[PDB]
From a paper:
The intracellular pathogens Legionella pneumophila (Lp) and Rickettsia prowazekii (Rp) inject an effector (RalF) that diverts the host trafficking small GTPase Arf1. RalF proteins are related to eukaryotic ArfGEFs, from which they depart by a unique auto-inhibitory capping domain that contains localization and functional determinants. One of these effector proteins, RalF, contains a Sec7 homology region, which is the catalytic domain in eukaryotic guanine nucleotide exchange factors (GEFs) that is sufficient to activate Arf by stimulating GDP/GTP exchange. In the case of Lp, LpRalF recruits Arf1 to the Legionella-containing vacuole (LCV), where the pathogen replicates.
Structural studies showed that the C-terminal domain of LpRalF intimately associates with the Sec7 domain to block access to the Arf-binding site. In this work, we demonstrate that interactions between an aromatic cluster of amino acids in the LpRalF C-terminal capping domain and lipid membranes provides a signal that relieves autoinhibition and converts LpRalF to a highly potent ArfGEF. Auto-inhibition and membrane recruitment are mediated by the same region of the capping domain, thus making both states mutually exclusive and establishing a membrane-driven binary switch. Our data show that the membrane sensor of the capping domain of LpRalF contains protruding α-helices that expose aromatic and lysine residues. This atypical composition and structure endows it with a dual sensitivity to packing and electrostatic properties of lipid membranes, but not to curvature. We propose that the aromatic residues encode the sensitivity of LpRalF to packing defects by peripheral insertion into the lipid bilayer, and the lysines recognize negatively charged membrane surfaces by electrostatic interactions. Our in vitro analysis predicts that LpRalF uses the membrane sensor encoded in the aromatic cluster to spatially and temporally regulate Arf activation during the course of LCV maturation. Consistently, despite its high exchange activity on negatively charged liposomes in vitro, M45-flagged LpRalFF255K failed to recruit Arf1 at the LCV in infected cells, likely due to mislocalization.
Numbering used by the authors: 1 to 347
């Protein structure tokens, strides 16, 4: 906590709250001016001014894949005590710290950071860092099973049901039977205090009948497609648009709804946009929302805001929620959406 930053804390708080970018750049400003490291310092301000800062934005800054952001987090998470803490408790504390982003990849980056720190501070508890990430994802999946009011008590995961999934999890080995009993019981008696973001950044398409939507229907078929063009899904975007697809991990669409992320990139303009699909399932419905969601987000580059607007305008269903991105204000996204929704609303 450096004194030049501490002095104008209120100013940095006012800037960050208004627009995170402004505030971050105002932290960097003082850091440059006083020949000091921003990553280690952003992390500190975020910690210190927790009761003051926009926790939605903070969580959103820390969960972003950008190099600077990724470093800030390594520093944020390192500044946490996990020494002495139980795996269940250390994690119980970690998650409690954030206004949890409402998107799988963002959550993953977070869980991945805890894993690396819990293992650093407790090298004896888990065999390696990969083993901590496994245990955490099993713990988070366990948290759903043990507290789902729909699932009958007879179908809710057992203690030995845990030990089974974790045979070969401790760096190609088993974890201590008494530690998993202490894990399972700790999380049986108390569920994780998980506060999520209200509305996630960019365009969010969500309805109880979005599953019925032709564009949504098409986009889903696309996720299990080989060599297909995206203009078949979105004819409002250019012909010249390349796509990459990241399919969901070990924890399937059944335990999140998360059906994956499509990344669209204009091969002439370098405008980028990402589509995220979430379809409610028996396990997910209770924790992650009962209605399908489509989150469209523009890249940092020029015209990315149009690509995103073009994809969202092609949808029949309306965009239920608009939210400012780190580089784009709510209004500009509305401007481009209504514009393409007036443009595409022609033969």
């Amino acid at each position: 906590s450096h004194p030049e930053i501490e002095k104008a804390q209120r100013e940095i708080i006012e800037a960050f709250n208004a627009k995170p970018k402004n505030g971050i750049n105002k932290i960097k400003e003082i850091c440059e001016q006083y020949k000091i490291s921003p990553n280690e310092e952003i992390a500190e301000f975020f910690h210190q001014q927790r009761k003051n800062l926009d926790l939605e934005a903070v969580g959103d800054y820390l969960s972003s894949p950008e190099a600077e952001n990724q470093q800030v987090l390594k520093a944020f998470t390192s500044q946490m005590n996990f020494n002495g803490q139980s795996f269940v408790e250390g994690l119980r504390t970690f998650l409690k710290t954030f206004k949890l982003p409402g998107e799988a990849q963002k959550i993953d980056r977070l869980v991945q950071s805890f894993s690396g720190a819990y293992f650093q501070q407790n090298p004896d508890v888990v065999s390696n860092a990969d083993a901590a990430y496994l245990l955490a994802f099993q713990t988070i999946m366990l948290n759903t099973d043990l507290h789902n009011p729909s699932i009958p008590e007879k179908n809710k995961m057992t203690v030995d049901g845990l030990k089974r999934n974790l045979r070969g999890g401790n760096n190609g080995g088993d974890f201590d039977a008494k530690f998993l009993e202490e894990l399972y019981s700790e999380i049986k008696a108390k569920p994780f205090e998980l506060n999520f973001v209200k509305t996630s950044p960019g365009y969010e398409l969500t309805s109880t009948t979005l599953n019925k939507d032709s564009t949504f229907k098409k986009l889903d078929s696309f996720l299990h497609s080989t060599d297909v063009n995206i203009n078949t899904v979105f004819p409002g975007i250019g012909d010249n648009v390349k796509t990459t697809v990241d399919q969901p991990k070990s924890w399937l669409s059944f335990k999140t709804g998360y059906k994956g992320t499509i990344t669209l990139t204009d091969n002439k303009t370098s405008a980028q946009a990402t589509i995220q699909v979430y379809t409610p399932n028996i396990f997910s419905k209770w924790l992650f929302g009962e209605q399908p969601r489509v989150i469209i987000q523009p890249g940092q580059t020029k015209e990315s805001i149009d690509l995103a607007a073009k994809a969202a305008a092609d949808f029949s269903s309306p965009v239920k929620n608009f939210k400012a991105t780190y580089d784009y204000e709510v209004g500009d996204l509305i401007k481009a959406y209504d514009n393409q929704k007036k443009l595409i609303t022609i033969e």
